[PDB]
Amino acid sequence: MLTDPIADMLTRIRNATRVYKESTDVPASRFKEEILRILAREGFIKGYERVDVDGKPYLRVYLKYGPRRQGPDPRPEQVIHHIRRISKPGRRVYVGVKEIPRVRRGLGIAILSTSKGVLTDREARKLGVGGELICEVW
Amino acid sequence: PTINQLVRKGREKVRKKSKVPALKGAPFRRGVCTVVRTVTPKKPNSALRKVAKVRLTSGYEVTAYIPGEGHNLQEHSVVLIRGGRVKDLPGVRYHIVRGVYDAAGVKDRKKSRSKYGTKKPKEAA
RNA sequence: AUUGAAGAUU
RNA sequence: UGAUGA
RNA sequence: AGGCGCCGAGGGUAGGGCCCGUGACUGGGGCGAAGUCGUAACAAGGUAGCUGUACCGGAAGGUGCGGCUGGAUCACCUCCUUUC
RNA sequence: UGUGGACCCGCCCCUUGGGGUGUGUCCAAAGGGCUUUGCCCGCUUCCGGAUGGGCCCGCGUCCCAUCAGCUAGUUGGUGGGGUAAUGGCCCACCAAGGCGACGACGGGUAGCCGGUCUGAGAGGAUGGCCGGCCACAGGGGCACUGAGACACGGGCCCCACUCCUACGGGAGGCAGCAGUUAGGAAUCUUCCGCAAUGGGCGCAAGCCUGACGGAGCGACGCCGCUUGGAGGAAGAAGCCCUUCGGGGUGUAAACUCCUGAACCCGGGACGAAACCCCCGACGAGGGGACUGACGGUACCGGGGUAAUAGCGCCGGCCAACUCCGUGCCAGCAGCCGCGGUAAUACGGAGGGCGCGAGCGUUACCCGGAUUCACUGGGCGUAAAGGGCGUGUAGGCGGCCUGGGGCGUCCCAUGUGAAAGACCACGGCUCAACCGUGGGGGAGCGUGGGAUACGCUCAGGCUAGACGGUGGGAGAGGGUGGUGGAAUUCCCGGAGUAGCGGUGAAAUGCGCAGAUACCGGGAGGAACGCCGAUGGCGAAGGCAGCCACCUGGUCCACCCGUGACGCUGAGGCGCGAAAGCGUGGGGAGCAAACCGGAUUAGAUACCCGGGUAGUCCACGCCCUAAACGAUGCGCGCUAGGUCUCUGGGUCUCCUGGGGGCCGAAGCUAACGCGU
Numbered sequence A: 001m002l003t004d005p006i007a008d009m010l011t012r013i014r015n016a017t018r019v020y021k022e023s024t025d026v027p028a029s030r031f032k033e034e035i036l037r038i039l040a041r042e043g044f045i046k047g048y049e050r051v052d053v054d055g056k057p058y059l060r061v062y063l064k065y066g067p068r069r070q071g072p073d074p075r076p077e078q079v080i081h082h083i084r085r086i087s088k089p090g091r092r093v094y095v096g097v098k099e100i101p102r103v104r105r106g107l108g109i110a111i112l113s114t115s116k117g118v119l120t121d122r123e124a125r126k127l128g129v130g131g132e133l134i135c136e137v138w
Numbered sequence B: 001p002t003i004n005q006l007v008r009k010g011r012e013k014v015r016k017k018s019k020v021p022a023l024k025g026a027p028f029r030r031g032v033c034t035v036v037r038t039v040t041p042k043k044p045n046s047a048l049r050k051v052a053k054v055r056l057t058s059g060y061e062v063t064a065y066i067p068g069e070g071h072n073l074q075e076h077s078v079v080l081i082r083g084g085r086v087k088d089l090p091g092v093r094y095h096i097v098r099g100v101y102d103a104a105g106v107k108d109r110k111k112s113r114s115k116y117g118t119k120k121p122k123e124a125a
Numbered sequence C: 001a002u003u004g005a006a007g008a009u010u
Numbered sequence D: 001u002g003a004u005g006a
Numbered sequence E: 001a002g003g004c005g006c007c008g009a010g011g012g013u014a015g016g017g018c019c020c021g022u023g024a025c026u027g028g029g030g031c032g033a034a035g036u037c038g039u040a041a042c043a044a045g046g047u048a049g050c051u052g053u054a055c056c057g058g059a060a061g062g063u064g065c066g067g068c069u070g071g072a073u074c075a076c077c078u079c080c081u082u083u084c
Numbered sequence F: 001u002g003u004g005g006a007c008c009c010g011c012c013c014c015u016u017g018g019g020g021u022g023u024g025u026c027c028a029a030a031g032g033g034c035u036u037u038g039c040c041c042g043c044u045u046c047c048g049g050a051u052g053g054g055c056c057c058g059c060g061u062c063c064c065a066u067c068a069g070c071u072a073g074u075u076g077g078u079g080g081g082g083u084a085a086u087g088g089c090c091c092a093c094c095a096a097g098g099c100g101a102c103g104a105c106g107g108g109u110a111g112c113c114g115g116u117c118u119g120a121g122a123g124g125a126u127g128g129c130c131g132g133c134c135a136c137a138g139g140g141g142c143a144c145u146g147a148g149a150c151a152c153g154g155g156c157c158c159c160a161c162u163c164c165u166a167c168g169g170g171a172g173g174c175a176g177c178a179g180u181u182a183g184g185a186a187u188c189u190u191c192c193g194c195a196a197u198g199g200g201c202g203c204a205a206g207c208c209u210g211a212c213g214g215a216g217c218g219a220c221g222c223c224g225c226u227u228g229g230a231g232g233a234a235g236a237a238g239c240c241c242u243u244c245g246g247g248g249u250g251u252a253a254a255c256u257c258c259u260g261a262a263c264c265c266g267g268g269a270c271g272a273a274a275c276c277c278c279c280g281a282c283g284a285g286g287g288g289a290c291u292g293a294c295g296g297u298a299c300c301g302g303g304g305u306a307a308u309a310g311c312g313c314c315g316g317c318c319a320a321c322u323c324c325g326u327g328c329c330a331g332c333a334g335c336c337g338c339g340g341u342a343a344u345a346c347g348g349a350g351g352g353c354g355c356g357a358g359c360g361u362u363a364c365c366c367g368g369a370u371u372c373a374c375u376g377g378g379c380g381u382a383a384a385g386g387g388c389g390u391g392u393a394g395g396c397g398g399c400c401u402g403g404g405g406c407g408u409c410c411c412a413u414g415u416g417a418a419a420g421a422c423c424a425c426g427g428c429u430c431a432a433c434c435g436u437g438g439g440g441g442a443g444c445g446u447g448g449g450a451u452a453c454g455c456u457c458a459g460g461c462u463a464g465a466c467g468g469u470g471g472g473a474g475a476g477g478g479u480g481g482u483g484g485a486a487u488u489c490c491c492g493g494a495g496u497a498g499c500g501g502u503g504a505a506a507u508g509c510g511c512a513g514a515u516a517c518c519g520g521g522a523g524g525a526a527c528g529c530c531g532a533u534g535g536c537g538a539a540g541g542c543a544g545c546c547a548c549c550u551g552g553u554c555c556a557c558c559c560g561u562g563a564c565g566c567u568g569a570g571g572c573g574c575g576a577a578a579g580c581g582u583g584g585g586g587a588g589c590a591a592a593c594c595g596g597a598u599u600a601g602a603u604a605c606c607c608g609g610g611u612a613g614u615c616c617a618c619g620c621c622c623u624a625a626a627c628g629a630u631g632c633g634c635g636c637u638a639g640g641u642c643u644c645u646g647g648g649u650c651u652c653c654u655g656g657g658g659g660c661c662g663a664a665g666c667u668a669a670c671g672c673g674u
């Protein structure tokens, strides 16, 4: 049935970038969108937009890389080095504000969902609230 | 295992076994001898190794090594036992403490004197 | 006696 | 079909 | 006061269940340089091996049935690779 | 006597038996001292406070499922009884219930915690001293008294022990301080004091206090200190090495000066100001006196002696090397391993490393061990995918909107005793030890708030799933029927001397005529070619042909339902071969077995026979190299080529199977790779 849609997205994304695709559809959900917004803003993706395919709502995700590279193996560095689900249907994961993780001494993000909406970790910390720890990303 | 699985069965504590029923934990036990046989080692080792059959305050009767140059033990000898396998002699897992009870210390012993149980000698000392 | 030394061999 | 211990 | 009664620690006889002991007789098992019989296995190990099962034999085993390749060598094959 | 309180009935407020009120009824007391008419210590009723407790409830609290069912006061009820008080706490009567895979019941083990040790942390381990709670006082019952006990030094009884006994009967209970004895590897003085603190009685003076404050024994632990300091040779002797030159112990000793642990003399504590008495007023406040176990100790001053070193280790891990001895011996040994005549590994010695009033050993706990993996592991060949399905509980659940706010998050607040821990500053000359102060803190309770995600309720969608219509391929299964080839036997023909079998043989069969050949018959079992690198099934597995009964599945159409999904502990079903039971069948094959060869032997390989069995029906068994040695579903991530089977606009395009090569990636490698 597809059991964790948000896992899915992270994975679709993880997969498309390692073969350096320009873009990936992922079937669209409001929540998925909210996570994408962060990705976009935090400068991990170029951007994203709604689209249809076979006339059902998707989300094209435009991915983003580094420059062509030095010697044998000219593959660009990845912008999204690591994108990992934390909370999962098997095991939900929640943090109080005092215990939100700091991803790769701040060079990374942790999307995290609160009752004040979906936020990066600094975002959440600032508005002094915690919630479901969605994924890390660096 | 899945996490549900760990919720269902959990992990299992690796709780493991003594090498030395000198029973009641006890760092030493008192026994009385029975045989003072000699034994051949195994492996690639050849020699005539000193051993006693010891009947213990544990209730237990077991074989123990008699370390050092030469002993003074026979049938009714009455001795303290300490644990320490021999390793060349499978089924020998306890040493006899030398210098306690009816086990003489090692006569003429200069170096690792504290094991072997031999008093500080007097020479130019 | 033989063997590096032994077991075995007279 | 066999070729003693280290 | 005294008496009788119920309850009641405990005890008895019958009946089961269960734990320790010791145990005549009895089954294998581990470990111990150079004892005995053969030679199953590892190379196609000299009958390819392993396997469940079933019978049989000092011993390893052997044989029956079915299965497996986790089998050597030679062929025909088609696949791949090779071009072109 | 009735301030009042108790109880019944009523009424009011309040809400489980909480307050209030009205009749009625019922219930108090003790005296003592005196600095004697006015005070002190007491007594009685009642309302409150304070402290201490009982009872109840949520959550948490070890091992075994090789313990799976348990339960008659059992579960509830109505009415009693009992208590300070709720309650099957107990009793009568009624009802038939309560509990359990979220682990009841049973077994094992165990006092629980504050803490402690360890760890980076999560965790593991633990509960000795100190503080808190519980339980017990030779073992087992039980009540009495009392505010309180069902009472360690109170009582009764039963039991086991010891003691006294005039044999009838009696006494007793160190898990209080010492101490004895036993067990054991092992654990202290039959000490000193009520001076302090605290406790009981007393108006007080006081008395009691093995609580306690000290001292004593034990390197058991922690901390502080000593066994000297500065000189002092190109460097004594001895000992050890030695290429015979020398090298080492070694500034180490000797020896010069200096200081002065111990020990001696002198002084000498704080800890103790209260109770009490006097003044005041028995108040506040002021004055006064008594009192030290530790102890002639600590500490201060004077004098003053060069005055203790041990244990472990030196193959690698692991810091530290040489000579003898020894010859797989004697021995070492945490693991790996040393020793067989040149041993840095044994024993000794010189020298060296390490620690030092200690050093080693053994036992035990955590560590390292991401080696039970939550943080943080794995299962193709290393240990590990269940033989396969079906689907029970359970776990998990697509897209949109709204309610609720259980999870989750936030603010406030209560709680989290002291000790300990951590930080500061203090007191013992330092430190150990101690004092004071500060700062953490999960968990839980209360109040308020948020609503993204999870949950739930209500609506909605069609991308998951299911269905409809139309088409397909298939050794998928079951039942009945039938076909030809071959083998065996039987009957007839013709026909003659061997056939068969092997490496070579022989056993065997043949003149009762076999082998080979032709014709007829019976029977059982298996299906050649097609046949594939092919297909079908969840697996096991499925192959002549025909009918019938029946399972799955693929494509197109985009028509219906509207998340109906995935997985699946247990259960149930299926499950090759061999084997079991009952009854059939029996051609060929063939364990066992009977022979022939072979061989050193041959309980085998080869050869001739042969029973079970192989076959059928029905019932069992439930195993396997039950294999892709690879659980099931879904999503995502280059391609090439071969192939089976659909559809299309038919070079090709597009589904669903089967293969190989191999992007990215993965893997210890081999490999794997829509």
Ligand SMILES: NC[C@@H]1O[C@H](O[C@H]2[C@@H](O)[C@H](O[C@@H]3[C@@H](O)[C@H](N)C[C@H](N)[C@H]3O[C@H]3O[C@H](CO)[C@@H](O)[C@H](O)[C@H]3N)O[C@@H]2CO)[C@H](N)[C@@H](O)[C@@H]1O
Binding pocket: E032, E035
């Ligand atoms: N170990 C389990 C089973 O034990 C058996 O092993 C036992 C005996 O069979 C085997 O015996 C061997 C013998 O096989 C070999 N052919 C001769 C040898 N002397 C024997 O040796 C044995 O016994 C001798 C006394 O003589 C002891 O010295 C020695 O420790 C032991 N290995 O030694 C084992 C006892 O030590 C199987 N042989 C063994 O392979 C199998 O695994």
Ligand SMILES: [Mg+2]
Binding pocket: none
């Ligand atoms: Mg050999």
Ligand SMILES: [Mg+2]
Binding pocket: B044, B045, B046, D006, F328
């Ligand atoms: Mg040897």
Ligand SMILES: [Mg+2]
Binding pocket: F377, F378
């Ligand atoms: Mg592992």
Ligand SMILES: [Mg+2]
Binding pocket: none
């Ligand atoms: Mg394996």
